Amino acid sequence: ATKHFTLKSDVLFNFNKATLKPEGQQALDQLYTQLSNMDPKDGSAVVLGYTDRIGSEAYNQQLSEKRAQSVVDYLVAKGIPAGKISARGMGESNPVTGNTCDNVKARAALIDCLAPDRRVEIEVKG
């Protein structure tokens, strides 16, 4: 089977940036063992980066890739083998919130409503 772990982008990173904050390092610390128990032969992990739909679609794809790779870098330095993990930047695609926030116009309320879309997903197979 496949396990799925969701991390909040706003906790891990500051805006426009892909440097892991101390709070992001601690969340990856608390998760490193649940991913440390991968299968040594069949196990692999994919780190998918996502953004919300505000701004440039190309810039959001690029930023999501840098954020997903930053997570990979940290977990590899912790001890996940570099050959068993990789990153993918999905940008605005595959949003969690659907059309829920369509009617929300004010920026602060909209930012809050779209927060579920700003996340890093870690899928662990085997």
PDB file of C-alpha atoms in Angstrom:
ATOM      1  CA  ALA A   1       0.000   0.000   0.000  1.00  0.00           C
ATOM      2  CA  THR A   2       0.885   3.708  -0.177  1.00  0.00           C
ATOM      3  CA  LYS A   3       1.025   6.174   2.719  1.00  0.00           C
ATOM      4  CA  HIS A   4       0.358   9.911   2.295  1.00  0.00           C
ATOM      5  CA  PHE A   5       1.597  12.741   4.532  1.00  0.00           C
ATOM      6  CA  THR A   6       0.549  16.393   4.160  1.00  0.00           C
ATOM      7  CA  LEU A   7       2.654  19.350   5.319  1.00  0.00           C
ATOM      8  CA  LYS A   8       1.551  22.991   5.320  1.00  0.00           C
ATOM      9  CA  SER A   9       3.634  25.122   2.955  1.00  0.00           C
ATOM     10  CA  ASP A  10       3.081  28.216   5.137  1.00  0.00           C
ATOM     11  CA  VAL A  11       4.694  26.438   8.099  1.00  0.00           C
ATOM     12  CA  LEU A  12       7.698  25.169   6.112  1.00  0.00           C
ATOM     13  CA  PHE A  13       8.555  28.260   4.026  1.00  0.00           C
ATOM     14  CA  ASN A  14       8.267  32.046   3.845  1.00  0.00           C
ATOM     15  CA  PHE A  15       6.636  33.698   0.839  1.00  0.00           C
ATOM     16  CA  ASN A  16       8.539  33.531  -2.497  1.00  0.00           C
ATOM     17  CA  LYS A  17      11.124  31.270  -0.819  1.00  0.00           C
ATOM     18  CA  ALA A  18      12.079  27.615  -0.527  1.00  0.00           C
ATOM     19  CA  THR A  19      14.390  27.729   2.515  1.00  0.00           C
ATOM     20  CA  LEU A  20      13.044  25.426   5.233  1.00  0.00           C
ATOM     21  CA  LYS A  21      12.132  27.330   8.382  1.00  0.00           C
ATOM     22  CA  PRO A  22      13.025  25.851  11.799  1.00  0.00           C
ATOM     23  CA  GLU A  23       9.383  24.850  12.221  1.00  0.00           C
ATOM     24  CA  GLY A  24       9.598  23.049   8.877  1.00  0.00           C
ATOM     25  CA  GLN A  25      12.752  21.202   9.887  1.00  0.00           C
ATOM     26  CA  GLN A  26      11.061  20.023  13.094  1.00  0.00           C
ATOM     27  CA  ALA A  27       8.012  18.748  11.191  1.00  0.00           C
ATOM     28  CA  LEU A  28      10.293  16.837   8.835  1.00  0.00           C
ATOM     29  CA  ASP A  29      12.192  15.574  11.895  1.00  0.00           C
ATOM     30  CA  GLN A  30       8.987  14.233  13.466  1.00  0.00           C
ATOM     31  CA  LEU A  31       8.191  12.457  10.208  1.00  0.00           C
ATOM     32  CA  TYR A  32      11.632  11.092   9.277  1.00  0.00           C
ATOM     33  CA  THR A  33      11.105   7.816  11.144  1.00  0.00           C
ATOM     34  CA  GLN A  34       7.663   7.089   9.678  1.00  0.00           C
ATOM     35  CA  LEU A  35       9.454   7.379   6.321  1.00  0.00           C
ATOM     36  CA  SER A  36      12.652   5.764   7.588  1.00  0.00           C
ATOM     37  CA  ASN A  37      10.762   2.442   7.701  1.00  0.00           C
ATOM     38  CA  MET A  38      10.499   2.292   3.907  1.00  0.00           C
ATOM     39  CA  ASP A  39      11.067  -1.045   2.235  1.00  0.00           C
ATOM     40  CA  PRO A  40      14.814  -1.187   1.427  1.00  0.00           C
ATOM     41  CA  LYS A  41      14.095  -2.726  -2.004  1.00  0.00           C
ATOM     42  CA  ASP A  42      10.532  -1.760  -3.005  1.00  0.00           C
ATOM     43  CA  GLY A  43      10.273   1.471  -1.019  1.00  0.00           C
ATOM     44  CA  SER A  44      10.301   4.881  -2.632  1.00  0.00           C
ATOM     45  CA  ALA A  45       9.072   8.347  -1.732  1.00  0.00           C
ATOM     46  CA  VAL A  46       7.792  11.159  -3.944  1.00  0.00           C
ATOM     47  CA  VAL A  47       7.577  14.728  -2.632  1.00  0.00           C
ATOM     48  CA  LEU A  48       4.929  16.769  -4.460  1.00  0.00           C
ATOM     49  CA  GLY A  49       4.841  20.553  -4.092  1.00  0.00           C
ATOM     50  CA  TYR A  50       1.631  22.524  -4.595  1.00  0.00           C
ATOM     51  CA  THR A  51       0.622  26.187  -4.462  1.00  0.00           C
ATOM     52  CA  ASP A  52      -2.664  28.069  -4.495  1.00  0.00           C
ATOM     53  CA  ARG A  53      -4.048  29.685  -7.663  1.00  0.00           C
ATOM     54  CA  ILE A  54      -2.993  33.296  -6.939  1.00  0.00           C
ATOM     55  CA  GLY A  55      -0.321  34.753  -9.217  1.00  0.00           C
ATOM     56  CA  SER A  56       1.645  33.455 -12.179  1.00  0.00           C
ATOM     57  CA  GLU A  57       1.056  29.826 -13.115  1.00  0.00           C
ATOM     58  CA  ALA A  58       4.658  29.390 -14.318  1.00  0.00           C
ATOM     59  CA  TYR A  59       6.134  31.049 -11.228  1.00  0.00           C
ATOM     60  CA  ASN A  60       3.970  28.909  -8.941  1.00  0.00           C
ATOM     61  CA  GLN A  61       5.058  25.712 -10.709  1.00  0.00           C
ATOM     62  CA  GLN A  62       8.721  26.720 -10.372  1.00  0.00           C
ATOM     63  CA  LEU A  63       8.325  27.713  -6.716  1.00  0.00           C
ATOM     64  CA  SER A  64       6.525  24.452  -5.900  1.00  0.00           C
ATOM     65  CA  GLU A  65       9.389  22.488  -7.449  1.00  0.00           C
ATOM     66  CA  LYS A  66      12.015  24.362  -5.414  1.00  0.00           C
ATOM     67  CA  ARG A  67      10.000  23.788  -2.228  1.00  0.00           C
ATOM     68  CA  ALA A  68       9.551  20.071  -2.960  1.00  0.00           C
ATOM     69  CA  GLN A  69      13.287  19.718  -3.684  1.00  0.00           C
ATOM     70  CA  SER A  70      14.154  21.577  -0.468  1.00  0.00           C
ATOM     71  CA  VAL A  71      12.151  18.942   1.446  1.00  0.00           C
ATOM     72  CA  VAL A  72      14.005  16.180  -0.423  1.00  0.00           C
ATOM     73  CA  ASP A  73      17.364  17.799   0.401  1.00  0.00           C
ATOM     74  CA  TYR A  74      16.572  17.834   4.113  1.00  0.00           C
ATOM     75  CA  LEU A  75      15.322  14.230   4.261  1.00  0.00           C
ATOM     76  CA  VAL A  76      18.334  12.976   2.293  1.00  0.00           C
ATOM     77  CA  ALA A  77      20.733  14.790   4.640  1.00  0.00           C
ATOM     78  CA  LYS A  78      18.824  13.074   7.481  1.00  0.00           C
ATOM     79  CA  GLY A  79      19.441   9.629   5.999  1.00  0.00           C
ATOM     80  CA  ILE A  80      16.916   8.777   3.309  1.00  0.00           C
ATOM     81  CA  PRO A  81      18.974   7.364   0.389  1.00  0.00           C
ATOM     82  CA  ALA A  82      19.114   9.830  -2.507  1.00  0.00           C
ATOM     83  CA  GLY A  83      18.094   7.098  -4.941  1.00  0.00           C
ATOM     84  CA  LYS A  84      14.835   6.331  -3.117  1.00  0.00           C
ATOM     85  CA  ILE A  85      13.290   9.847  -3.117  1.00  0.00           C
ATOM     86  CA  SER A  86      12.550  12.608  -5.637  1.00  0.00           C
ATOM     87  CA  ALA A  87      10.571  15.842  -6.032  1.00  0.00           C
ATOM     88  CA  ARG A  88       7.837  17.085  -8.376  1.00  0.00           C
ATOM     89  CA  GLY A  89       6.489  20.629  -8.607  1.00  0.00           C
ATOM     90  CA  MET A  90       2.767  20.618  -9.435  1.00  0.00           C
ATOM     91  CA  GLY A  91       2.070  24.346  -8.991  1.00  0.00           C
ATOM     92  CA  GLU A  92      -1.608  25.311  -8.952  1.00  0.00           C
ATOM     93  CA  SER A  93      -2.749  22.006 -10.420  1.00  0.00           C
ATOM     94  CA  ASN A  94      -4.889  19.503  -8.511  1.00  0.00           C
ATOM     95  CA  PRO A  95      -6.215  21.987  -5.924  1.00  0.00           C
ATOM     96  CA  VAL A  96      -7.771  20.736  -2.704  1.00  0.00           C
ATOM     97  CA  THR A  97     -10.382  23.484  -2.336  1.00  0.00           C
ATOM     98  CA  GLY A  98     -12.169  23.093  -5.684  1.00  0.00           C
ATOM     99  CA  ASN A  99     -14.597  25.965  -6.269  1.00  0.00           C
ATOM    100  CA  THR A 100     -15.089  26.599  -2.526  1.00  0.00           C
ATOM    101  CA  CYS A 101     -13.365  29.997  -2.534  1.00  0.00           C
ATOM    102  CA  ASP A 102     -14.731  31.252  -5.880  1.00  0.00           C
ATOM    103  CA  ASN A 103     -16.951  33.874  -4.183  1.00  0.00           C
ATOM    104  CA  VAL A 104     -14.263  35.090  -1.733  1.00  0.00           C
ATOM    105  CA  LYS A 105     -12.889  38.389  -3.068  1.00  0.00           C
ATOM    106  CA  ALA A 106     -11.014  40.120  -0.236  1.00  0.00           C
ATOM    107  CA  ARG A 107      -7.356  39.121  -0.264  1.00  0.00           C
ATOM    108  CA  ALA A 108      -6.837  38.229   3.406  1.00  0.00           C
ATOM    109  CA  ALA A 109      -9.987  36.094   3.533  1.00  0.00           C
ATOM    110  CA  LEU A 110      -9.084  34.541   0.185  1.00  0.00           C
ATOM    111  CA  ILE A 111      -5.554  33.679   1.368  1.00  0.00           C
ATOM    112  CA  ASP A 112      -7.071  31.868   4.376  1.00  0.00           C
ATOM    113  CA  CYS A 113      -9.677  30.034   2.272  1.00  0.00           C
ATOM    114  CA  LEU A 114      -7.014  28.745  -0.148  1.00  0.00           C
ATOM    115  CA  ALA A 115      -4.598  27.633   2.589  1.00  0.00           C
ATOM    116  CA  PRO A 116      -5.422  23.898   2.099  1.00  0.00           C
ATOM    117  CA  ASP A 117      -4.021  24.216  -1.440  1.00  0.00           C
ATOM    118  CA  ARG A 118      -0.597  25.389  -0.157  1.00  0.00           C
ATOM    119  CA  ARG A 119       0.988  22.133   0.855  1.00  0.00           C
ATOM    120  CA  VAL A 120       3.734  19.597   0.313  1.00  0.00           C
ATOM    121  CA  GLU A 121       2.572  16.004  -0.141  1.00  0.00           C
ATOM    122  CA  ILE A 122       4.856  13.042   0.579  1.00  0.00           C
ATOM    123  CA  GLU A 123       3.778   9.707  -0.917  1.00  0.00           C
ATOM    124  CA  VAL A 124       5.607   6.595   0.337  1.00  0.00           C
ATOM    125  CA  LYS A 125       5.126   3.370  -1.641  1.00  0.00           C
ATOM    126  CA  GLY A 126       6.191   0.093  -0.041  1.00  0.00           C
TER     127      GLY A 126
END
